[PDB]
Amino acid sequence: TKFSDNYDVKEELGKGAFSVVRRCVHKTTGLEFAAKIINTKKLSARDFQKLEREARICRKLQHPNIVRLHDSIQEESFHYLVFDLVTGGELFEDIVAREFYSEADASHCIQQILESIAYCHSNGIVHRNLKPENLLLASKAKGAAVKLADFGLAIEVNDSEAWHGFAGTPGYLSPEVLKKDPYSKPVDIWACGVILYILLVGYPPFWDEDQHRLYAQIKAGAYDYPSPEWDTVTPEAKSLIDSMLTVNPKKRITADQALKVPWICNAIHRQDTVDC
Amino acid sequence: TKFSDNYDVKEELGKGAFSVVRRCVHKTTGLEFAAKIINTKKLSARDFQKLEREARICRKLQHPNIVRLHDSIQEESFHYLVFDLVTGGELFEDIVAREFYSEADASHCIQQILESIAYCHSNGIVHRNLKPENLLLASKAKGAAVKLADFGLAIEVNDSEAWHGFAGTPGYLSPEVLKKDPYSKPVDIWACGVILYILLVGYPPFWDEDQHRLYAQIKAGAYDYPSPEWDTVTPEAKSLIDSMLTVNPKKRITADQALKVPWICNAIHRQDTVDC
């Protein structure tokens, strides 16, 4: 063990409950990492379970758009989790700063998120808690990759849908989850459309200080494209938001499908093969 | 023991019943501390219990905005409590001096208090006796941190609400406590809103030389924003005072939530994740 033996600890990048993230360097190589240090002694059973969940999953996943969990050390009373070093902050604090994005900037950004997602989805991993406070920018540099994080809710599924409990973030929840129907991968895609909408204008498709109504609207599929903002927005951008924001999850588009839309790439289109 | 062996005692910073606070220096290091010296011989059982209460709790808590209890020595007939040295006095005597604060100055100040509070709240610690006579300014220097004190009432709680007796300070008590309902962490948040209001204008939301009426008003939620003072005050400052001064504690905002309000930080906002 002895993280201290292989890791030089630097400054603090932030903190949470029973945890602090600090910058740290590896000794022999000199590589750079964001290291999440947690109080194992002060953990609760459910907190620990989470810990073992995110841990194990992220360990499986390797991708440019996925904050890589590189290591996991246990030193007596503290558990260390070695993460990609990121320095661009959340995509949230970036959206707010610029208020909103062009269409070009949106497609690129989204395309990235679509890929990290399609990937998890190709590894039986659903994230469940997709949102801009969980999307991180490699660095301040422009074009800097967007990297997916906080898998504390992420789950492993097979080829069939089933109820996995109720968890997520208000504004991003899917119909199928609120309806308490059996759900799967498209739940994340639903959050995508939401974030897209946000990216395009800087405000949500659904909102309301009443959760009931909020939820009624979500399950209804109740959003639109208010003028004037949405006036100079193309149809190919709206149409896409539709296919993601599809209430029937069975008819909702997949990440892989969505990564084949010309508004992402750039008549005839790319059709997925069908085998029975 | 022999505090005298490790501590050079300097001048008197003030005094209370069976106690005097004097400035003192550590010998080998030379560090500076406010040292509360108490007559153990002249203590009553309830006074002692308190002593052991504040003691043990503060010992747990470490924070920039929390007067750190560094040590606790017992010398025959006197018990010493080694505290952070503070020299700015109470935030009370500062408010009175300047009468009241700008909005910027208020948010900063409050944000600090919100953090010390959120912290205790994250360590099962509720303060119960929150007020400006208990908030201390590190030094006379401007920007000097505000540090929380007098935990003589502070209590330890779990995840559930229950009656913890009736204690606090008139003008700051919460509805739930006066209603003698089962109470918890939000009781402090209620005192926050109160202090905020005060910070913004230099007079309380609730007051009355009749306690019954005073209390009737508190439980009622009976305050307002009288003109002209409150005329140049933003809505984001009032609205916030509302969410803290929420009579239904279940619907009252949390410190952590409140530390995510743009009037504190500086459309879209930061949503807390929900797991069941």
UniProtKB/Swiss-Prot annotation, chains A, B:
Tissue and organ expression note: Expressed in the nervous system. Observed in the ADF and AWC neurons. Position in AWC neurons is regulated by microtubules. Localized to clusters in ventral cord neurites which appear to be required for glr-1 trafficking. Also present in oocytes.
Effect of residue 142 to E: Slight increase in calcium independent kinase activity, no effect on translocation to the neurite
Domain (Protein kinase) ranges: 7-264
Annotated catalytic residues: 129
Top-level taxon of origin: Eukaryota
Cellular compartments annotated: Cytoplasm; Cell projection, Axon; Perikaryon
Phosphothreonine carried by residues: 273
Gene null: resulting phenotype: Increased frequency of defecation, typified by a weaker repetition of the defecation motor program, an echo, 10 s after the primary motor program. Abnormal spicule protraction. Lack of tph-1 transcriptional up-regulation during learned olfactory aversion to bacteria. Reduced brood size, body length and width. Lethargic movement. A gain-of function mutation reduces locomotory activity, alters excitation of three muscle types and lengthens the period of the motor output of a behavioral clock. Both classes of mutation inhibit neurotransmitter release.
Effect of residue 95 to K: Loss of cooperative activation of adjacent holoenzyme subunits
Effect of residue 270 to E: Increase in calcium independent kinase activity and translocation to an unlocalized pool in the neurite. Small decrease in glr-1 trafficking
Positions that bind ATP: 13-21, 36
Assembly with partners or alone: Dodecamer. Subunits are tightly packed around a central ring-shaped scaffold with extensive contacts between the regulatory segment of one kinase and the catalytic domain of another enabling cooperative activation of a subunit by the adjacent molecule. Interacts with and phosphorylates daf-16; the interaction promotes daf-16 nuclear localization. Interacts with egl-2 and tir-1. Interacts with nsy-1.
Role according to the record: Acts in the signaling of a variety of pathways and processes. Phosphorylates 'Ser-319' of daf-16 in response to stress signals, such as heat, starvation and oxidation, which plays a role in prolonging lifespan. Required for viability under chronic osmotic stress in which it acts downstream of osr-1. Has roles in locomotion, oocyte maturation, brood size, egg laying, defecation, meiotic maturation and neuronal cell fate specification. Required for the regulation of synaptic density and neuromuscular junction morphology. Regulates the synaptic trafficking of glr-1.
Annotated family: Belongs to the protein kinase superfamily. CAMK Ser/Thr protein kinase family. CaMK subfamily.
Name of the protein this chain belongs to: Calcium/calmodulin-dependent protein kinase type II
